[PDB]
Design a protein around this ligand. Structure first.
Ligand SMILES: N=c1c2ncn([C@@H]3O[C@H](COP(=O)(O)OP(=O)(O)OP(=O)(O)O)[C@@H](O)[C@H]3O)c2ncn1[C@@H]1O[C@H](COP(=O)(O)O)[C@@H](O)[C@H]1O
Ligand SMILES: N=c1c2ncn([C@@H]3O[C@H](COP(=O)(O)OP(=O)(O)OP(=O)(O)O)[C@@H](O)[C@H]3O)c2ncn1[C@@H]1O[C@H](COP(=O)(O)O)[C@@H](O)[C@H]1O
Ligand SMILES: [Cl-]
Ligand SMILES: [Cl-]
Ligand SMILES: [Cl-]
Ligand SMILES: [Mg+2]
Ligand SMILES: [Mg+2]
Lengths: 207, 378, 376, 206, 77, 78, 77
């Protein structure tokens, strides 16, 4: 395959990306949920699409299995976007990374135990606040961890705050703002710029 | 199982590596570079004197049991060259080369090596662009001797252009750090935004947007920038080296004045030599501080040349066990004289211990036929 | 200031070191030894598998930040050769050579180096004395190629003689350790004392007192020792190698059957090559560890004081004359310079009128449209 | 004060429900309709947590759950160092395997392995005396070899249909996998009286 | 083999002409991007003529490569 | 080449025409010392353009071909 | 073109021999599956010899296609 391979994040991000694509040359022929297909052709014959876990997008781009991709800034910070170019802030799928604990519960007199998917971000954030933390790695349902004692605080993406409030939790500290970003493989940027520039300019025009 | 980024180099690859190390070193010596071979370990006081934070994190620490002081395993030979030049080099021009193992705590690139065989050359005591030009001639003479089909692409930069703009524009540290991130990521739109509110903003936009077109770059800059002596000279040096590379060496050159890796240690022109489409440079070089003492130099990982170079197939010879033991003493001495001559020519000749003794990769047997020892292909 | 036992090798010495490393390696390759170049670092699990306590203390430790596991900087390449032979070597005869830097936490002898350039050769899969004989012939062929005026003296030992006596006498560990200390120090009087109360004590005294006289050593031992098959063969191997060294190589040989350094790893014959009257052996070798192995190694950097290269030709092009040239004249001059460099001349293209290489022997000067070499 | 039971959501949960009901534990609501994280049961002394399969061993090891049902693939990858693996439940059975492209040759390099099971991959290929570059992925292992991200994969295989439907074939069998009953070291000592009847009924249920 | 010619057919070729005027309006960087694009089309088996003059037309032209708003697209004739 | 002229005269018209070919040719004597008398002759030709741009295009085709061969051997042009 | 031969290299070929004995042990359905596999290998450029006799050996053999526990795999020689 000589065209561009585009790595898209599966869930929340995919919904707000589709309008940006259609404004460019690109739109999917099938639908991701209905079809059990991994590689998707588009309206543009020079663009191919991969529908991936949000966590896997940076990996595919960095190793050049995809030429470019749309990925959450929370995922890029946690992954370490060392070997990719972060070309555009798409300003979609906006949210915040925050700390959250139980409502009105006091901080214990010890090293805080942090339950999170975002272990590098947690460690980094609490290091910047001069706090030493014991980090516990989890993959899903961060809300649960403080309720059964698994950690004192969590770190997770928060938009409205309803999931936290519905489980008796409150937000504590703002870590940073998050949005989906356009990432491009270092080598693809040099070798396939002719294919990329018109798509990059249409995404730029779409905001 | 070896650690990540750590591999044996075995057999024909080991022989190739030894040939490359030796031949490249000898070439450097014939160009007038003095070979030095500093040790793997030193006190951190000398090894990390004026080191960047990346170099410090890249350097393994160990304790000297004779003094209780901290040492490091070197991650970079260049600081040892400075130590040596300070003691032995004097005030004039001094040239050094080296080839030695270095150890890194973490790999640089994806699946990169943590134990490169670092080979390099350095010129101290010359401010002129002629010293950088000489280093290019040495490098390319070395690259061309390797007879590779792989193509080397060179990217030139020059950190002084950005450093001088940052001075004249009087940028804060956070403004400097933001532009460097935007440059690193080629974020042209957001760079355009930030530059509309910064002093001399259009100059910082111009570097990223038009820095590739080095012939016209000075004429796209603001009057304050065009009057700065250091910007005019830096752009001039870029044009000189670009021309020299194309004309003397048939080398494809790109320019990137927003290439600001090693902002800490580079003091001027920078050189990055890429092999085919591999992400990490094969060769890294440029101006640095030799201290006021000028320094320029390059280095490379000899082990990354192994995949792109070929030696002639070896001649691997076995003497017939039975026939050799049938010989009288005078016959044996004649045969051993013949074997010594073959070995002088680079044939790999095994004198067998037993009738089953067989070398790996056997190409030939040395066999007796009617009172004559001849080589026969297997 | 470098740490004790740590020195730069600079300039002509560095060039000489590189020439020695390369020429010795190439010789080994032409004798059918396969070059291997293992890494400076490994996990300790592989690097110190079955290591002695001396080797463990000699090995610097560092932590792998990707796994949290311990690594070591190698103090010895031989264990890496074993690892390689186990994976690639098969059941037959396999030959290996190597040359690489090793790091030691403490110097081995008084005023020794902690960063030797270790070069060596090893044969796996041959039980015969013929493999040891081949290693001797390779070593001495290498030594003779160096054209040294320094003489190598060889001391032979054989750890099996003492190990078999210790078995037959049924010695405890503390008794074994005391005799090894007394042997290490050749404390003959105190050895005489301790041997009066030990079982087969007079045999352990005889090794130290008369082990030098290998022709008569079997006849000085007790009837139980003379009936031991392994003692008789070990003594026989010593006599065979001694003779081979004297006759084939005109080599002075001494015997010391109380040489028990590396009691842990040596399994038989041992070889120590001394250079003039220097205390630490230049060459160390012997049988080691079901797969047979024999080998030697040396510090290439210790050869530097005993070897000489031909004086280098160091050439400077005239700055003024070179800058007077047109483009076509410069390209002709550079063609000429490339040819001189191909022949091994060290030619400096001057950057300035003061640019002078260290140790200048010749100038390349223009006289009537001709670039000729003139001695300074 | 009661026992907290950590269950794996998805494939494992289906085959666990019969084993629970035989023990006198059974959920009052359903996990699909309700977005509740903590579930009461028929037994008032037992509480249930429906978790990601990957999170079960973490909750048990730290004592946030007293015991749990977890895949053996997850336990091997996690390193079940501080928990007791008491019973092989013999449910949710599958194999961990290597798979590459159909009939494709192994390249002349360090094999690049794309997998969720990075510790298992590294360990397996180390036991075969092979040096590998491991690439961490969280989903859709089947895709990785088709776009060049890795030479082989390591993943759980039951029928082999997902591999065959994407042009891949299994290569090496690494090990058999089934869901296991794990218990927290401290809970086992302190709350054995509560545990023993449930442990014995699970034991009887196969 | 020549007797098979009357009894076999290949797929119709894609024969492309770059717009002469639009190509000459480009700056150097624009030309290098266009040539990169053309190299990729040729790798896929498109037969692409870089015109020498405004009249230079390949035999059997099926498509033009034309510039519209900073984008080179293929249009059928 | 003379067969290309014959073909161009019949089929080429007055405008620009481009031709390529690859075929065996036979020589009565070799050109160089130990040269071949049966080369496999491959080539390209542009008719109907006076401009240096036609020669430039031929160079671009040639060098695109040479670079696709991934040779370590160096081509020098006189 | 013949003067380019000394200066160019192709990737080493894959030269495959199907095991004569194992192939003749197969039932008809097994043979058709094996031939489908062989057709796919040949589509990829593998050079696969269907042996006429037990001695039929191609020049420069790199691999055998061998049956091990109801599976046809390629093994290097
Ligand atoms: N609100 C978001 C949210 N907003 C934006 N994004 C982006 O979407 C990416 C994750 O996409 P997914 O939806 O696939 O991930 P997920 O829903 O966390 O987990 P899955 O079950 O889908 O695997 C993140 O990397 C973000 O960049 C969000 N990802 C997750 N959420 C969650 O959605 C819920 C809504 O939060 P409130 O609005 O605060 O109640 C909470 O559970 C939030 O943690
Ligand atoms: N076949 C299984 C399978 N069998 C048993 N299990 C167990 O189920 C646990 C994971 O449960 P999940 O619900 O998370 O499985 P999942 O497929 O990741 O589900 P999603 O979260 O992705 O929706 C594993 O730890 C195993 O113990 C399996 N988990 C995943 N699979 C996958 O299911 C697919 C079908 O396999 P075949 O039918 O053999 O092709 C393949 O992609 C397999 O990798
Ligand atoms: Cl809140
Ligand atoms: Cl390096
Ligand atoms: Cl299969
Ligand atoms: Mg350096
Ligand atoms: Mg002609």
């Amino acid at each position: 395959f000589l065209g561009l391979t585009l790595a898209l994040s599966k869930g929340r991000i995919l919904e707000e990306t589709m309008p940006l694509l259609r404004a460019a040359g690109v739109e999917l022929l099938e639908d991701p949920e209905a079809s059990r297909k991994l590689i998707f052709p588009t309206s543009n014959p020079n663009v191919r699409v991969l529908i991936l876990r949000a966590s896997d997008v940076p990996t595919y781009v960095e190793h050049g299995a995809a030429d470019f991709g749309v990925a959450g800034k929370d995922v890029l910070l946690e992954h370490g976007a060392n070997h990719v170019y972060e070309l555009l802030d798409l300003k979609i799928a906006q949210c915040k990374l925050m700390t959250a604990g139980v409502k009105d519960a006091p901080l214990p007199n010890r090293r805080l135990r942090i339950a999170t998917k975002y272990v590098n971000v947690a460690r980094a954030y609490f290091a910047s606040q001069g706090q030493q933390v014991d980090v516990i790695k989890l993959y899903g349902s961060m809300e649960l961890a403080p309720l059964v004692g698994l950690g004192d605080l969590i770190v997770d993406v928060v938009d409205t705050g309803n999931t936290l409030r519905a489980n008796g939790l409150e937000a504590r500290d703002h870590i940073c703002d998050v949005s989906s970003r356009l990432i491009v493989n270092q080598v693809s940027y040099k070798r396939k710029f002719a294919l990329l520039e018109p798509i990059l300019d249409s995404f730029k025009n779409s905001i | 199982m070896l650690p990540d980024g750590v591999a044996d180099v075995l057999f024909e690859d080991a022989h190739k590596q030894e040939v490359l190390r030796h031949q490249l070193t000898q070439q450097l010596i014939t160009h007038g570079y003095q070979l030095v071979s500093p040790p793997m370990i030193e006190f951190t006081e000398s090894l990390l004197s004026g080191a960047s934070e990346d170099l410090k994190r890249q350097t393994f620490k160990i304790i000297d049991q004779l003094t209780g002081r901290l040492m490091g395993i070197r991650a970079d030979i260049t600081p040892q060259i400075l130590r040596i030049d300070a003691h032995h080099g004097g005030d004039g021009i001094a040239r050094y080369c080296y080839a030695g193992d270095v150890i890194h705590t973490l790999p640089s690139g994806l699946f990169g090596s943590r134990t490169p065989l670092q080979l390099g050359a350095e010129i101290f005591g010359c401010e002129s662009i002629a010293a950088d030009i000489e280093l290019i001639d040495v490098l390319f003479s070395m690259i061309n001797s390797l007879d590779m089909s792989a193509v080397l692409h060179v990217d030139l930069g020059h950190v002084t252009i950005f450093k001088r703009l940052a001075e004249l524009a009087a940028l804060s540290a956070s403004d400097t750090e933001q532009l460097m991130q935007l440059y690193a990521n080629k974020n042209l739109p957001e760079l355009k935004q930030v530059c509309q509110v910064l002093p001399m903003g259009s100059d910082f936009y111009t570097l990223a947007r038009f820095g590739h077109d080095i012939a016209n770059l000075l004429g796209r800059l603001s009057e304050n920038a065009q009057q700065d002596t250091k910007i005019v000279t830096a752009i001039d040096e870029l044009q000189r080296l670009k021309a020299h590379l194309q004309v003397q060496w048939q080398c494809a050159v790109s320019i990137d004045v927003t290439e600001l890796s090693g902002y800490h240690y580079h003091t001027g022109i920078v050189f990055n030599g890429y092999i085919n489409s591999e992400t990490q440079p094969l060769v890294r070089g440029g101006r640095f501080d030799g201290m006021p003492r000028q320094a320029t130099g390059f280095s490379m990982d000899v082990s990354r040349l192994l995949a792109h170079t070929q030696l002639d197939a070896p001649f691997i010879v076995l003497i017939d066990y039975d026939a050799f033991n049938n010989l009288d003493s005078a016959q044996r001495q004649l045969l051993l004289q013949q074997v010594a001559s073959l070995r002088q020519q680079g044939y790999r000749v095994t004198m067998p211990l037993t009738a089953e003794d067989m070398p790996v990769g056997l190409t030939h047997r040395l066999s007796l036929a009617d009172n004559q020892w001849r080589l026969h292909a297997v």
